Swiss-Prot record:
<comment type="function">
    <text>Receptor tyrosine kinase which binds promiscuously membrane-bound ephrin-A family ligands residing on adjacent cells, leading to contact-dependent bidirectional signaling into neighboring cells. The signaling pathway downstream of the receptor is referred to as forward signaling while the signaling pathway downstream of the ephrin ligand is referred to as reverse signaling. Activated by the ligand ephrin-A1/EFNA1 regulates migration, integrin-mediated adhesion, proliferation and differentiation of cells.</text>
</comment>
<protein>
    <recommendedName>
        <fullName>Ephrin type-A receptor 2</fullName>
    </recommendedName>
</protein>
<comment type="similarity">
    <text>Belongs to the protein kinase superfamily. Tyr protein kinase family. Ephrin receptor subfamily.</text>
</comment>
<feature type="modified residue" description="Phosphoserine">
    <location>
        <position position="256"/>
    </location>
</feature>
<feature type="domain" description="Protein kinase">
    <location>
        <begin position="13"/>
        <end position="262"/>
    </location>
</feature>
<feature type="modified residue" description="Phosphotyrosine">
    <location>
        <position position="28"/>
    </location>
</feature>
<feature type="modified residue" description="Phosphotyrosine; by autocatalysis">
    <location>
        <position position="135"/>
    </location>
</feature>
<feature type="active site" description="Proton acceptor">
    <location>
        <position position="139"/>
    </location>
</feature>
<feature type="binding site">
    <location>
        <begin position="19"/>
        <end position="27"/>
    </location>
    <ligand>
        <name>ATP</name>
    </ligand>
</feature>
<feature type="topological domain" description="Cytoplasmic">
    <location>
        <begin position="1"/>
        <end position="281"/>
    </location>
</feature>
<comment type="subunit">
    <text>(Microbial infection) Interacts with human herpes virus 8/HHV-8 glycoprotein L/gL and glycoprotein H/gH heterodimer; this interaction triggers EPHA2 phosphorylation and endocytosis, allowing virus entry.</text>
</comment>
<comment type="subunit">
    <text>Homodimer. Interacts with SLA. Interacts (phosphorylated form) with VAV2, VAV3 and PI3-kinase p85 subunit (PIK3R1, PIK3R2 or PIK3R3); critical for the EFNA1-induced activation of RAC1 which stimulates cell migration. Interacts with INPPL1; regulates activated EPHA2 endocytosis and degradation. Interacts (inactivated form) with PTK2/FAK1 and interacts (EFNA1 ligand-activated form) with PTPN11; regulates integrin-mediated adhesion. Interacts with ARHGEF16, DOCK4 and ELMO2; mediates ligand-independent activation of RAC1 which stimulates cell migration.</text>
</comment>
<feature type="modified residue" description="Phosphothreonine">
    <location>
        <position position="47"/>
    </location>
</feature>
<feature type="binding site">
    <location>
        <position position="46"/>
    </location>
    <ligand>
        <name>ATP</name>
    </ligand>
</feature>
<feature type="modified residue" description="Phosphoserine">
    <location>
        <position position="279"/>
    </location>
</feature>
<comment type="function">
    <text>(Microbial infection) Acts as a receptor for hepatitis C virus (HCV) in hepatocytes and facilitates its cell entry. Mediates HCV entry by promoting the formation of the CD81-CLDN1 receptor complexes that are essential for HCV entry and by enhancing membrane fusion of cells expressing HCV envelope glycoproteins.</text>
</comment>
<feature type="region of interest" description="Mediates interaction with ARHGEF16 and ELMO2">
    <location>
        <begin position="6"/>
        <end position="281"/>
    </location>
</feature>
Length: 281
């Protein structure tokens, strides 16, 4: 008994603006009337262009079916789909500030430590929920987290998510080599997202190639501390990068730890030493 995915009638949806485009469809900002013509919500509208294959169809609608199973503050809400009419659409809640990685790059240094940790807490809460609903995301990265105008971060882009049974530099070593994707490999990816947030969207491992990232991780290298990063936050992301996946924290542990730090915020004032990459005398 999966949750009913609502089929939305096209007369209930208006597209107001074209805000992204790919080879397979576009993303629009729009409005959705509900229940019935009495409430209006702003929505994101993702289409699938004519000519789509069976695989594209199952991937596109399957992504909506996954979203439709969830009801969590930190998971993008599915309003519904249009599949009876073409082009087919996935209609979700509108996220005014877009993808988290690009947003942070355009807000470089403008947030407080407490705000950044609060973003991480919300992301972790959504991932904990996702994991305990028996899904692995497999593509967790700041670029797949959306931000609404209240600065709430929500996990999106479930196109590669799977019921339990991709950029190298976000993926756990056992998922790279053995295709063993689990909630524990999402935890590795979350540690990278932690580093992305605390650096305002720095590129993980900078100019290193994918082969070089694999060599470094394999040798025990880990991403160095971000600037002005709480020691507690860096130790936590370091634990997400344990080679042995059973030694990594669960999302349950991550949410609990972040809550304890936010509850006693002077805990965040102890900073990990930033390794000076240049010397000015």
């Amino acid at each position: 008994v999966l949750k009913f995915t609502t089929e939305i009638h096209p007369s209930c949806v208006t597209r107001q603006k074209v805000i992204g485009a790919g080879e397979f469809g576009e993303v629009y900002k729009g409005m959705l009337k509900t229940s019935s013509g009495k409430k209006e919500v702003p929505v994101a509208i993702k289409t699938l262009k004519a000519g789509y294959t069976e695989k594209q169809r199952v991937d596109f609608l399957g992504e909506a079916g996954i979203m439709g199973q969830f009801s969590h503050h930190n998971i993008i809400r599915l309003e519904g789909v249009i599949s009876k009419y073409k082009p087919m659409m996935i209609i979700t809640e509108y996220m005014e500030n877009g993808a988290l990685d690009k947003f942070l790059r355009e807000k470089d240094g403008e947030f407080s430590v407490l705000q950044l940790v609060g973003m991480l807490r919300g992301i972790a809460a959504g991932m904990k929920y996702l994991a305990n609903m028996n899904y692995v995301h497999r593509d967790l990265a700041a670029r797949n987290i959306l931000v609404n105008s209240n600065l709430v971060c929500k996990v999106s882009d479930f196109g590669l998510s799977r019921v339990l049974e991709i950029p190298i530099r976000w993926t756990a070593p056992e998922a790279i080599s053995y295709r063993k994707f689990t909630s524990a490999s999402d935890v590795w990816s979350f540690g990278i997202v932690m580093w992305e947030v605390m650096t305002y969207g720095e590129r993980p491992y900078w100019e290193l190639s994918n082969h070089e990232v694999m060599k470094a991780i394999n040798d025990g290298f880990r991403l160095p501390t971000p600037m002005d990063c709480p020691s507690a936050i860096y130790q936590l992301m370091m634990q997400c990068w344990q080679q042995e996946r059973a030694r990594r924290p669960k999302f349950a542990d991550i949410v609990s730890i972040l809550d304890k730090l936010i509850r006693a915020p002077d805990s965040l004032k102890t900073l990990a030493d930033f390794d000076p990459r240049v010397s000015i005398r």
